[PDB]
Write an enzyme that holds these catalytic residues in place. Structure first.
Site, PDB file in Angstrom:
ATOM      1  N   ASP A 185       9.712  -7.954 -31.025  1.00 48.09           N
ATOM      2  CA  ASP A 185       9.894  -7.238 -32.286  1.00 48.09           C
ATOM      3  C   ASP A 185       9.111  -7.908 -33.456  1.00 48.09           C
ATOM      4  O   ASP A 185       8.478  -7.189 -34.266  1.00 48.09           O
ATOM      5  CB  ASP A 185      11.409  -7.025 -32.653  1.00 48.09           C
ATOM      6  CG  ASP A 185      12.253  -8.278 -32.507  1.00 48.09           C
ATOM      7  OD1 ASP A 185      11.737  -9.324 -32.068  1.00 48.09           O
ATOM      8  OD2 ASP A 185      13.448  -8.217 -32.824  1.00 48.09           O
TER       9      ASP A 185
ATOM     10  N   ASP B 181     -20.229  -0.699 -46.458  1.00 47.37           N
ATOM     11  CA  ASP B 181     -21.553  -0.354 -46.930  1.00 47.37           C
ATOM     12  C   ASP B 181     -22.741  -1.175 -46.342  1.00 47.37           C
ATOM     13  O   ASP B 181     -23.742  -0.579 -46.030  1.00 47.37           O
ATOM     14  CB  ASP B 181     -21.580  -0.256 -48.457  1.00 47.37           C
ATOM     15  CG  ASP B 181     -21.640  -1.614 -49.168  1.00 47.37           C
ATOM     16  OD1 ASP B 181     -22.485  -1.718 -50.051  1.00 47.37           O
ATOM     17  OD2 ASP B 181     -20.829  -2.542 -48.925  1.00 47.37           O
TER      18      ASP B 181
ATOM     19  N   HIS C 146     -20.312  -6.959 -55.100  1.00 50.52           N
ATOM     20  CA  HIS C 146     -19.026  -6.878 -54.412  1.00 50.52           C
ATOM     21  C   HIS C 146     -19.010  -7.711 -53.099  1.00 50.52           C
ATOM     22  O   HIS C 146     -20.056  -7.925 -52.471  1.00 50.52           O
ATOM     23  CB  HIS C 146     -18.631  -5.417 -54.210  1.00 50.52           C
ATOM     24  CG  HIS C 146     -19.497  -4.671 -53.241  1.00 50.52           C
ATOM     25  ND1 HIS C 146     -20.759  -4.210 -53.558  1.00 50.52           N
ATOM     26  CD2 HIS C 146     -19.288  -4.319 -51.950  1.00 50.52           C
ATOM     27  CE1 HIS C 146     -21.300  -3.626 -52.503  1.00 50.52           C
ATOM     28  NE2 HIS C 146     -20.419  -3.669 -51.513  1.00 50.52           N
TER      29      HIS C 146
ATOM     30  N   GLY D  56      14.620 -10.465 -34.355  1.00 49.02           N
ATOM     31  CA  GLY D  56      13.932 -11.491 -35.086  1.00 49.02           C
ATOM     32  C   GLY D  56      13.100 -12.345 -34.184  1.00 49.02           C
ATOM     33  O   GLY D  56      12.650 -11.879 -33.089  1.00 49.02           O
TER      34      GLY D  56
END
Ligand SMILES: Cc1ncc(C[n+]2csc(CCOP(=O)(O)OP(=O)(O)O)c2C)c(N)n1
Ligand SMILES: Cc1ncc(C[n+]2csc(CCOP(=O)(O)OP(=O)(O)O)c2C)c(N)n1
Ligand SMILES: *[C@@](C)(O)P(=O)(O)OC
Ligand SMILES: *[C@@](C)(O)P(=O)(O)OC
Ligand SMILES: COP(=O)(O)C(C)=O
Ligand SMILES: COP(=O)(O)C(C)=O
Ligand SMILES: COP(=O)(O)[C@H](C)O
Ligand SMILES: COP(=O)(O)[C@H](C)O
Ligand SMILES: [Mg+2]
Ligand SMILES: [Mg+2]
Lengths: 562, 562
Positions: free
Chosen positions: B443, B27, B113, B472
Site C-alpha cells: 500500500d 520543448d 527556462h 501503512g
C-alpha cells in the site's frame, strides 16, 4: 539539561517558524523523526513521494520564509533533486536534511542498501552540492549545533537550498539545551555607508530630473523580501508601477498607480508604451528569463536604468558591489518624497475589464476564464499557477490587493504546483485559517504529481484545485506537434481523484460553460474555504492565452537554432 | 541517402532490440521524438512522470537487454535520477537521452527556462556523470554517429546507465544512412589465455577434491549474462545449487538439485547447513549487500571459495584480475563433467511445497500467502516484488522453472516496481504475449508511483497488480516506530484506481481470506492475462514474514551503533 541533536534541529526550526516538516521516512532517518513529536506544535506532513515533498517544501518556504524537507540516503535524496533545483533557480530557502548511514557503517564501507554498491558514501552529497548554496555532512558532535545553525541562517538569508547530512548515530547524541536560548543570527550586515550614500544621492538626482519615471517590480522583489519597501516607494513617489510575470503579486494591483504586467514585446500596447517611454526605470529585483521577458524582448534604449538587487545595485553603466537593496531602499525612502515633489502624475494604462455578459450556455474559453477569475479572488488569497496555459493566462488576471502569487516562470517544472499547493496550504493554515489557496493546474501537469492530493486530504487542508481539462499538453501542441501522440495523455476521471484518495468531506464539480462557472464561483458557500474542492474546467484543446501563442513560436525558433 | 541524427539514434536502438521509448516530452526534445514514428515498430510510452519513466526503462532493460529513456533538460533529467542511480547500483543498461538547449543558446548563455539562472549548461550533465558509466554531450555532427554508438555499446556491454545529451538543433541535421549498415560492436574482449587457464586448472583441481561442493548463484549471474553457463554448470556437475534473494529467478527452482535460497543466518536451518558445511563454494556473481546476506551473515566453514565476477575471478585469498566469468565458465564447462565424475550426490534441502488445509474463512497472513503464491505461478512468469514485506516474502515462494524475478534488493527504492512493471510488460509483450507480469507491491510503495498504472491502461497492458494492504509501512514499523504517525499513510480506495485512470477493460477484487484467495487465483479465466487486474490483499498491520522480522532488527542495530 540536554537534548538530542535531532531535538535541537527541530527546536531551531520552530524558532524560524517552520512548523510543518516534509519528506518521507527511511531507516536512516527514523530516530531523527521521533523528535518532531517532542516539539510542541510541529508536525510531519507524511508526503506521498520525495519529489512532491520538495515541491511542497518550496511552496511552504515561499509563504513562511523557509522550510525543511527530510529524506533518506540515496533513494529519498535523489528523488527530491528536481524540487531542490527549482528552489535554487527561483531563490527559495529550502533546508534539505538527509538521514545518512551511521559513521561506523561509512568508515567501514558497508555494502548497504541505497548505495551504488561501490562503498562511496559521498556521491549523493557531491551531486547535491551543485544545487545548494552550502552543505554540511555532520561527523563531529562538538561542532554540530554550530553547523546546523550555519545551514539554517544560510537557507533563510540567502534564500537558496542548503543540504544537511545527518548520520543516524549522531542524531541521538545530546547537546546542551541552553544552546537554544541564543537565537540564530538571521540578519544581513548593513551596507557600506559611503557606497550606499552614493547610490542614494545618485538615484535621488535621477528621480529629481525624470519627467516620466516608472517602477518595475520583478522576481527578486518577492524572493528577497523588498515588497514593503517597494510598496512605500510607489506610495511616496506616485510613479506608475508595473510588475513582471515572475513578480506578479509582489505589488498591489488595485493601487491607483498600478499600470500592468510588463512582458516586453508581449505586453499590451498601452503597457508596452507606458514602460518603454519612461525616461527613468526603477527596477526592483530583475530576473530576465526567456518567458519572464517575452524571449528577451525589452526595448528601452534610454538608460537611467536603476537596478536594485539583493546584493548590489546598478545605475546606468556603473555597478555598486555589496549595495543591498533592502537597506538601500529603506534609506532612499526617508528622502524620496522630497526628491519627487515636482512630479506631475502621468496617467497609467487603465485596467483590463470585466467580461461582457454572455448566454449562460456559452462554452468556456481561456481568455474569458482569466478575466473572470478576477471576480472570484479576494484579498489575502494565494493563487498558484502551473507551467502551461495556466501560468500564461494568470498574467491577464487582475489581482485584489494583498494577493500572493506562485508561478515557477524560470524553472518551469510541470507538476510542481500540486506539491507547492500542499505546502502553501500548510503555511496558509498557520498564517491565517481563512486565507484561500487556489490552484490552477493543467490536466497533463497533474498526472506527474497527483498523489500529493492525498496528503492534503489526510490533513483536512481545503485548497481549490482547478484542473484545466484541454485533453493533453496544449502549451507543447502550440510549440511543435499539434497532433503528435507525445502531446496526448491518458484521460482521467478527475472527479474521482478525491474519493479514490480517501476524501470524505469534499466537492468535485465539472464546469463547461460560463453559466456553470458563474453559478459555482458566485455561490457564497463555495467562496468559503470549508472543504477541499476540485473543479474540472473543460476547455478546447488548442485554446490558449494570446501571449502563449506568441511565446510558443519564439521558443520553437530558438531551439531549432540553426 | 541521408537520415536525421535523431533517426540514426532510433535505428540504432532498434538494432539492439529497443522497441519502446520511455520519458516525457519537453520543448528541447520534441524534434527528437518526431523520428520515433518514422521507424517501423517503434513506440513512445507517454509516461506519467520521469522518475516512473526511468523505473520503467530499468524493468524494460532487465527483460530486453537494454532500454532508453528520453527526458528534457534540467526538469526531466533531474526527475529521473533516482531511477538512473538504481540502474547503476543494480547494473541495468539504461541509456538516458536528454534533449538540451541548442549549441548557440548555450554559447550565448541565454537565461532559459529549466536552468539555474546562472548561465551554466553543464551542471546537470556533471550531476548525471556521478551515476553513469560514461556520458556524451554531443556538439559536433561529424562525430555524433560514433559517439552515439559508443554510448549504446557501453550501456549494453557494461549493463550500466549511460548519459547522452543532444542539443535540439543537432537532431535535425542529417548523416549518411549507410552508417547503419555496419553493426555496433557489442562484444567482450576475450580473456588472457594464461590467466584464464590458471583459474580453470585451479577450480577443476578443487572440484576433484571436493566431497560436498555447492553452487551459489547471485545478482551478477543475471545482470551480467551467465545464467546459460550456470544452468549447464549445475547440469554437468549435479552439485547442489542455491540462489540468493537478489539472484532469485536466475536458476531453475524445480531442478532436482535446487537446494533453496541462501541468506546467511536468515536461511532455513537445512539450507544454512547445506551451504555452510560445503567444502567447496562455486559462487557466481556475488553481490554481498545487507538485505541479500542477512546483514553480512555468511558463515562458510570452508576456505575453498571461488568467486566468479564479470571482470575478475577470486579463488580462496587470490584475485585473478581481468578473468571474466562468462568466458571462464564457458571454458570451465568444457572440462567440468570429467573433473566432477567421481562425485556422489549429497541430498538437497526442501520445505513443504504446500500449505496445510485451513478454514476458507481464515484471515490472510503473509507466511501463508508467500507459500500459496507458488501454486499460482507458471513457467514464463515475470515476478516483481517491491521493497517491503513483498520482497522478503517472495524468498519463501517456490518458482516454476523459467521464472524471471525482479527485486531491487540493493538499491531498494520503494515505488520502483510500479514503473518496472510497465516496462517489464512492454518487454514481455514484445518477447511473448503469453508471459504474465505479476507485481507484489505494498500500500505504501504504490503511493509514490501510482500514476504509472495510467500508462499500463493506455497501452492495453495486462499485468496482475497485487497490492498488499496492511495499513501503512509495515517493514519500517518492524525497524522503528511501530505506531509512529510517520509509518502511517492516507488510506486509498485501491479498487477505484483503475477506472479513475480511464480503465474500461479490467478487474479489481479485494481478498481477505484464504477462501477468497483460492477462489480467485484457482479460477481459469483469472489465470489468463487477458486484462489488467488489481487484487487488493488485506493483511494485518504488524504481519511480516519471519525473515523480515529478524532483518529489521539487525538493520535497526546497524543504524544505532557508534
Ligand atoms: C518535469 C517536467 N517534464 C516535462 C516538462 C515539459 N513540459 C512543459 S509544459 C508541458 C505540458 C503541460 O501540460 P498541461 O499541464 O496539460 O498544460 P496546458 O494543456 O494547460 O498547456 C510539458 C510536458 C516540464 N516543463 N517539466
Ligand atoms: C524512494 C524511497 N523512499 C523511502 C524509502 C524508505 N522505505 C523503505 S520501505 C518503506 C515502506 C514501504 O511500505 P509498504 O510498501 O506499505 O510495504 P509493507 O508495508 O508491505 O512493508 C519506506 C518508506 C525507500 N526505500 N525508498
Ligand atoms: C534577483 C535575481 O534580481 P537578486 O539579484 O536580487 O537575487 C540574488
Ligand atoms: C557482480 C557484482 O558480482 P559483478 O562483479 O559481476 O559486477 C560487475
Ligand atoms: C519571512 O520570514 P519570517 O521572519 O516570517 C521567519 C522568521 O520565518
Ligand atoms: C542485437 O540484439 P541483442 O541480441 O543485442 C539484444 C538481446 O538486445
Ligand atoms: C532500508 O530501510 P528502510 O528505511 O526500511 C527502507 C527499505 O529504505
Ligand atoms: C518550456 O518548454 P516546454 O517544453 O513547453 C516545457 C515548459 O518545458
Ligand atoms: Mg492540458
Ligand atoms: Mg504496507
Amino acid at each position: 539539561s540536554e537534548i538530542t541533536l535531532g531535538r535541537y534541529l527541530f527546536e531551531r526550526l520552530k524558532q524560524v517558524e517552520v512548523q510543518t516538516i516534509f519528506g518521507l521516512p527511511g531507516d536512516f532517518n527514523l530516530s531523527l523523526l521521533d523528535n518532531i513529536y517532542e516539539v510542541p506544535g510541529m508536525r510531519w506532513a507524511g508526503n506521498a513521494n520525495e519529489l512532491n515533498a520538495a515541491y511542497a517544501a518550496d511552496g511552504y518556504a515561499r509563504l513562511k520564509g523557509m522550510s525543511c524537507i527530510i529524506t533518506t540516503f540515496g533513494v529519498g535524496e535523489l528523488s527530491a533533486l528536481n524540487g531542490i533545483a527549482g528552489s535554487y533557480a527561483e531563490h527559495v530557502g529550502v533546508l534539505h536534511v538527509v538521514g545518512v548511514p551511521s559513521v561506523s557503517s561509512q568508515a567501514k564501507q558497508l555494502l548497504l542498501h541505497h548505495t551504488l554498491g561501490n562503498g562511496d558514501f559521498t556521491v549523493f552529497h557531491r551531486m547535491s552540492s551543485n544545487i545548494s548554496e552550502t552543505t554540511a555532512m555532520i561527523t563531529d558532535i562538538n561542532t554540530a549545533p554550530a553547523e546546523i545553525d550555519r545551514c539554517i541562517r544560510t537557507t533563510y538569508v540567502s534564500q537558496r537550498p542548503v543540504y544537511l547530512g545527518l548520520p543516524a548515530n549522531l542524531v541521538d547524541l545530546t547537546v546542551p539545551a541552553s544552546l537554544l536560548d541564543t537565537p540564530i543570527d538571521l540578519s544581513l550586515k548593513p551596507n557600506d555607508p559611503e557606497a550606499e550614500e552614493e547610490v542614494i544621492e545618485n538615484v535621488l538626482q535621477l528621480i529629481k530630473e525624470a519627467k516620466n519615471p516608472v517602477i518595475l517590480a520583478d522576481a527578486c522583489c518577492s524572493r528577497h523580501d523588498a515588497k514593503a519597501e517597494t510598496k512605500k516607494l510607489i506610495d511616496l513617489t506616485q510613479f506608475p508601477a508595473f510588475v513582471t510575470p515572475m513578480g506578479k503579486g509582489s505589488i498591489d494591483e488595485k493601487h491607483p498607480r498600478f499600470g500592468g504586467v510588463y512582458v516586453g514585446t508581449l505586453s499590451s500596447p498601452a503597457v508596452k508604451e507606458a514602460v518603454e517611454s519612461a525616461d527613468l526605470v526603477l527596477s526592483v529585483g530583475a530576473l530576465l528569463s526567456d518567458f519572464n521577458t517575452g524571449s528577451f524582448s525589452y526595448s528601452y534604449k534610454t538608460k537611467n536604468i536603476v537596478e536594485f538587487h539583493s546584493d548590489y545595485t546598478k545605475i546606468r553603466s556603473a555597478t555598486f558591489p555589496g549595495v543591498q537593496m533592502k537597506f538601500a531602499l529603506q534609506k532612499l525612502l526617508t528622502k524620496v518624497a522630497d526628491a519627487a515633489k515636482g512630479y506631475k502624475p502621468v496617467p497609467v494604462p487603465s485596467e483590463p475589464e470585466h467580461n461582457e455578459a454572455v448566454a449562460d450556455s456559452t462554452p468556456l474559453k481561456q481568455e474569458w476564464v482569466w478575466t473572470q477569475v478576477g471576480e472570484f479572488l479576494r484579498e489575502g488569497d494565494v493563487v498558484i499557477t502551473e507551467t502551461g496555459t495556466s501560468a500564461f493566462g494568470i498574467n491577464q488576471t487582475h489581482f485584489p490587493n494583498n494577493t500572493y502569487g506562485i508561478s515557477q516562470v524560470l524553472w518551469g517544472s510541470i507538476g510542481f504546483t500540486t506539491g507547492a499547493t500542499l505546502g502553501a496550504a500548510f503555511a496558509a493554515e498557520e498564517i491565517d485559517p481563512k486565507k484561500r489557496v487556489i490552484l490552477f493546474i493543467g490536466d497533463g501537469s497533474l498526472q506527474l504529481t497527483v498523489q500529493e492530493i492525498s496528503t492534503m486530504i489526510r490533513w483536512g487542508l481545503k485548497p481549490y484545485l482547478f484542473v484545466l481539462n484541454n485533453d493533453g499538453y496544449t502549451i507543447e501542441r502550440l510549440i511543435h506537434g499539434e497532433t503528435a501522440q507525445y502531446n496526448c495523455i491518458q484521460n482521467w476521471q478527475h472527479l474521482e481523484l478525491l474519493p479514490t484518495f480517501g476524501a470524505k468531506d469534499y466537492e468535485a464539480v465539472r464546469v463547461s460553460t460560463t453559466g456553470e462557472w458563474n453559478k459555482l464561483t458566485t455561490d457564497e458557500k463555495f467562496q468559503d474555504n470549508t472543504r477541499i474542492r476540485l473543479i474540472e474546467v473543460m476547455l478546447p484543446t488548442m485554446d490558449a492565452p494570446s501571449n502563449l501563442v506568441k511565446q510558443a513560436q519564439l521558443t520553437a525558433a530558438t531551439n531549432a537554432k540553426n
